[PDB]
């Protein structure tokens, strides 16, 4: 067992706040924002040895990353940015930093009660997306 075990499973989106504005800050175009904002993804998190896999599954699009904590990887985001990403565990929080074109955004995942809370931040704009077990 590992601390990361509290994340593993299949999670469904139950609430979203400020996501359109977060996407605007990131640079997502209008049509993608509208379709993304309508999505109700499932988030599937699994671990095999040192490799963590996170899959986001929705209508329109499925995206999946696999990574080792602390080890940078190149990532194509759901909005088609090519970014360089690093994910670490900081005091029980999974912290995902994405860098591209001199910009940065951070996505944090935290277990709070029976929820998986996702906080997305770009400059001063935060979006909070709450998932529950499917
Ligand atoms: O997993 C999340 O809740 C999180 C995110 C999420 O779900 N984004 C989703 S789902 C989803 C899409 C996007 C999306 N994002 C973005 C920019 C903001 C990054 N452009 O498109 C597009 C296609 C889809 F078919 F509609 C399905 C993004 C932020 O980090 C947590
Ligand atoms: Cl780490």
Going 82 to 30 to 134 to 115, the CA torsion angle's sign is: positive
Strands 103-112 and 93-100: antiparallel
Site of tokens 């940078």: 72
**Number of domain units in the chain:** 1
- Check whether 95 is labelled as a binding-site residue: no
Helix (H), strand (E) at residue 99: strand 93-100
- Check whether 22 is labelled as a binding-site residue: no
Resolution limit, Å: 1.1
- Check whether 130 is labelled as a binding-site residue: yes
Experimental method: X-ray
Q: Of all residues in the chain, what percent are helix, strand and coil, respectively (each to 5)?
A: 15, 55, 25
Tell me if 109 CB under 6 Å of ligand 1.
no
Ligand 1 pocket test, pick from 13, 23, 39 with the greatest ligand atom count within 8 Å of Cβ, gives 39
Strand partners, 43: 11, 56
Task: Enumerate residues 6+ apart whose C-beta is below 8 A from 18.
Answer: 125, 126, 127, 128
Ligand nearest to the CA of 69: 2
Strand partners, 13: 131
Strands 42-48 and 82-90: unpaired
> Domain with 23 in it: what CATH number?
2.40.128.20
Are the CB atoms for 118 and 20 separated by under 8 Å?
no
| Domain housing 63 | 5-131
């Amino acid at each position: 067992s590992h601390m990361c075990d509290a994340f593993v499973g299949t999670w469904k989106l139950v609430s979203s706040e400020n996501f359109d504005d977060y996407m605007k800050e990131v640079g997502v175009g209008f049509a993608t924002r509208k379709v993304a904002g309508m999505a109700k993804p499932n988030m599937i998190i699994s671990v095999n040895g040192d490799v963590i896999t996170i899959k986001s599954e929705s209508t329109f699009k499925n995206t999946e990353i696999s990574f080792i904590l602390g080890q940078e990887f190149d990532e194509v985001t759901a909005d088609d940015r090519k970014v360089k990403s690093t994910i670490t565990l900081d005091g029980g929080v999974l912290v995902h930093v994405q860098k591209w074109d001199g910009k940065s955004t951070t996505i944090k995942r935290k277990r709070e009660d029976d929820k998986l809370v996702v906080e997305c931040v770009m400059k001063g704009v935060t979006s909070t997306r709450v998932y529950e077990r499917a």
